[PDB]
Swiss-Prot record, chain A:
Organism per entry: Homo sapiens
Keyword Transmembrane helix tagged: yes
Main location: endoplasmic reticulum
Gene name of the record: MMGT1
Quaternary organization: Component of the ER membrane protein complex (EMC).
Name used for this protein in its record: ER membrane protein complex subunit 5
Curated annotation (Swiss-Prot), chain B:
TPR repeat locations: 86-119
Compartments, as annotated in UniProt: Endoplasmic reticulum membrane
Source organism, top-level taxon: Eukaryota
Residues with PTM N-acetylalanine: A1
PTM notes: Ubiquitinated when soluble in the cytoplasm, leading to its degradation by the proteasome. Interaction with EMC2 prevents its ubiquitination and degradation.
Protein function: Part of the endoplasmic reticulum membrane protein complex (EMC) that enables the energy-independent insertion into endoplasmic reticulum membranes of newly synthesized membrane proteins. Preferentially accommodates proteins with transmembrane domains that are weakly hydrophobic or contain destabilizing features such as charged and aromatic residues. Involved in the cotranslational insertion of multi-pass membrane proteins in which stop-transfer membrane-anchor sequences become ER membrane spanning helices.
Assembly description: Component of the ER membrane protein complex (EMC). Interacts with WNK1 (via amphipathic alpha-helix region); promoting the ER membrane protein complex assembly by preventing EMC2 ubiquitination.
Lineage of origin: Eukaryota, Metazoa, Chordata, Craniata, Vertebrata
Name of protein: ER membrane protein complex subunit 2
Family designation: Belongs to the EMC2 family.
Gene name linked to the record: EMC2
Transmembrane segments: none
UniProtKB/Swiss-Prot annotation, chain D:
Protein name, per record: ER membrane protein complex subunit 1
Subunit structure: Component of the ER membrane protein complex (EMC).
Organism the protein comes from: Homo sapiens
Origin superkingdom: Eukaryota
Clinical condition linked: Cerebellar atrophy, visual impairment, and psychomotor retardation: An autosomal recessive, neurodegenerative disorder characterized by developmental delay, intellectual disability, hypotonia, scoliosis, cerebellar atrophy, and variable dysmorphic features.
Topological domain ranges for the Cytoplasmic compartment: 40-49
Cellular localisation: Endoplasmic reticulum membrane
Swiss-Prot record, chain E:
Organism in which the protein naturally occurs: Homo sapiens
Subunit architecture: Component of the ER membrane protein complex (EMC).
A Pfam entry, by short name: EMC3_TMCO1
Keyword rRNA processing: no
Coiled coil (UniProt feature): none
Positions in the Lumenal compartment: 1-11, 113-150
Result for mutant: R28K: No effect on EMC assembly and no effect on membrane insertion of hydrophobic transmembrane helices-containing proteins by the EMC
UniProt protein name: ER membrane protein complex subunit 3
Length: 103, 148, 100, 49, 243
């Protein structure tokens, strides 16, 4: 799922860049002709707004963690069996050691 | 089931599962060693920072399970990268205590204490050594002193 | 509610700020691409921020009590710094295309 | 001829050495790449030691 | 829109200045990380630091504590006869977040290199009293203040990416064994100053100022309730098998 969102964001960014290039070409043509104070066509403006909204949707979905405020639910499935043993004090005197000695 | 488990798996999932194992600090030395040398021989490409902790965990499990050969194999690799490191010294002393001649690991711990005054791990390992060497009362006394 | 974990709150705030920054940065690029007057540009930035806030609220929906204690930071948050980084990218592509 | 009312404010200045600018631009990237590994190894050494 | 500019000035000014400021910020961050040095720590200072943390957790979490043990702890800390705080006594340019000087120097060098230049115009209407700010090298009185020079461009650029830098970077939390050492280091770095006597007296009086309210007495609230979470919870624990 995240890969699809990343691809959609990339496609939206590419569409935005293409709309930018089209607007730049429009302004370059406008500089050619005297007067004719007209705005850029509305179709490209709608396309760039569509690219603005599409990339704005996946940018929220990419980084969603929203971890729970309560910390009692994170030590909830953990049992006391694993907590009893500690990495610090570790005695290497067990029957399994001499059981596994020969293979 | 060994080959079947080895088929439907990726290295990323292996590393994530071992990281979760380290987070839960469970006892699965059999399974930790079983997946340990596998990622060591299959990928052996990148994630050096991860692979250092990987090596340490693997030899910790091998000290428990049955295998000192891999323990020394990881010790030499750890010593190659870091020439002077107190963690490798503590691990080597732990393995020495496991094998024989506890007193050598002992003076190793006193040299570690002489170098770095603040070393809780060495004192904890000495406390665990005297927990199994002598009576538990003396170990309780030293633990109370360290806890003070 | 009796016990609160600071790590979760920090992560939530970091995600919210990252989203607010990225959305504002892209809104600046859009405004620079079109090119408007200051009043219209500021109103457009405010509209984009409101739309982002509405989408963020819709993202949570049910069970939002455990996710966010309140809603004030979701509505009012990162409005000055986000505008500061939006003004950069608004004029970055504005003069690059029109003036140049 | 061409007359200049107030010097020039529309065209690039003639005396603009590109060697210094390019050298600085490349050196910044080289320095950030050099210091990335230094920071990484410093973090790793502090964690281990 | 006027003042037709060249297309070969935008490719030799804007991109260079943007890359320069970006990588200068990156250099500053990485060099700050590199120059960070650890501080020597005496075992005694760590000792009183942990004692202070213990007093703090006693103050914070004291409701869920037997009353007898609570007064035992409070007496041990206080102990008017001997007391541990009372007897145990020890014996006793202008660099201020230097980040402005480098940016000022970089902006000054950039402005010195570019004498007469027009980088970009700002859409925002600006007054004529900021014209000496913005141009600083152009001899024009009829021109508007919208057209700014490279100095203001870089000045706005450094603030433009202030929040962008944190997007790439972030925080780190690992090394569970080294986490404890980090906590001791930071806590004793808090407890560096040599004002042990007044701190001990302040904590001694603050501990007396605390009252006791056993939060364990309110048990009747749970007895009259409903246990239905323990089966929606139990239904979602069944599907998972054993590896």
């Amino acid at each position: 799922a995240p890969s699809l969102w990343k691809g959609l964001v990339g496609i939206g960014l590419f569409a935005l860049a293409h709309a930018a290039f089209s607007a730049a070409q429009h302004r370059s043509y406008m500089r050619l002709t005297e007067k004719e104070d007209e705005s850029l066509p509305i179709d490209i403006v709608l396309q760039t707004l569509l690219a603005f909204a599409v990339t704005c949707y996946g940018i929220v979905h990419i980084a969603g963690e929203f971890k729970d405020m309560d910390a009692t639910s994170e030590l909830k499935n953990k049992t006391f069996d694993t907590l009893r043993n500690h990495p610090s004090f570790y005695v290497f005197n067990h029957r399994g050691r001499v059981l596994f000695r020969p293979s | 089931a060994k080959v079947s488990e080895l088929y439907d798996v990726t290295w990323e999932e292996m590393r994530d599962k071992m990281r979760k194992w380290r987070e839960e600090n469970s006892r699965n030395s059999e399974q930790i060693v079983e997946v340990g040398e596998e990622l060591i021989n299959e990928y052996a490409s990148k994630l050096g920072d991860d692979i250092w902790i990987i090596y340490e965990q693997v030899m910790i499990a091998a000290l428990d399970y049955g295998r000192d050969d891999l323990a020394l194999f990881c010790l030499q690799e750890l010593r190659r990268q870091f020439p002077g490191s107190h963690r490798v010294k503590r691990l080597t002393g732990m393995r020495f205590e496991a094998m024989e001649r506890y007193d050598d690991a002992i003076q190793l711990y006193d040299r570690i204490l002489q170098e770095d005054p603040t070393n809780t791990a060495a004192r904890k390992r000495k406390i665990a050594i005297r927990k199994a060497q002598g009576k538990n009362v003396e170990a309780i006394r030293e633990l109370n002193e360290y806890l003070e | 509610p009796p016990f609160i974990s600071e790590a979760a709150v920090r992560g939530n705030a970091a995600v919210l700020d990252y989203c607010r920054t990225s959305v504002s940065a892209l809104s600046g690029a859009t405004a620079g691409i079109l090119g408007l007057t200051g009043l219209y540009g500021f109103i457009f930035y405010l509209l984009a921020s409101v739309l982002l806030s509405l989408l963020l609220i819709l993202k949570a929906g049910r069970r939002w009590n455990k996710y966010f204690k309140s809603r004030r930071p979701l509505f009012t948050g990162g409005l000055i710094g986000g505008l500061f980084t939006y003004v950069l990218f608004w004029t970055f592509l504005y003069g690059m295309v029109h003036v140049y | 001829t061409r007359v200049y009312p107030s010097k020039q404010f529309d065209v690039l200045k003639d005396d603009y050495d590109y060697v210094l600018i390019s050298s600085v631009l490349f050196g910044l990237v080289f320095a950030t790449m050099i210091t990335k590994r230094l920071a990484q190894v410093k973090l790793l050494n502090r964690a281990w030691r | 829109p006027e003042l037709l500019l060249d297309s070969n000035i935008r490719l030799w000014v804007v991109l260079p200045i943007v890359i320069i400021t970006f990588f200068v910020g990156m250099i500053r961050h990485y060099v700050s990380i590199l120059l960070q040095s650890d501080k020597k720590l005496t075992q005694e200072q760590v000792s009183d630091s942990q004692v202070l943390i213990r007093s703090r957790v006693l103050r914070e979490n004291g409701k869920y504590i037997p009353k007898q043990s609570f007064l035992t702890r409070k007496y041990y800390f206080n102990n008017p006869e001997d007391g541990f705080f009372k007897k145990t006594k020890r014996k006793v340019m202008k660099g201020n977040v230097t980040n402005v000087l480098p940016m000022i120097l970089i902006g000054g060098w950039i402005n010195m290199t570019f004498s007469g230049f027009v980088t970009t115009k700002v859409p925002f209407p600006l007054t004529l009293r900021f014209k000496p700010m913005l141009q600083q090298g152009i001899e024009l009185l009829t021109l508007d203040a919208s057209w700014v020079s490279s100095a203001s461009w870089y000045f706005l650029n450094v603030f433009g990416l202030r929040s962008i830098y944190s997007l790439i970077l972030g925080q780190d939390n690992a090394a569970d064994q080294s986490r404890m050492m980090q906590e001791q280091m930071t806590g004793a770095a808090m407890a560096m100053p040599a004002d042990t006597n007044k701190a001990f007296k302040t904590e001694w009086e603050a501990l007396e100022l605390t009252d006791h309210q056993w939060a364990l007495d309110d048990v009747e609230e749970e007895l009259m309730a409903k246990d239905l979470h323990f089966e929606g919870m139990f239904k979602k624990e069944l599907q998972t098998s054993i590896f």
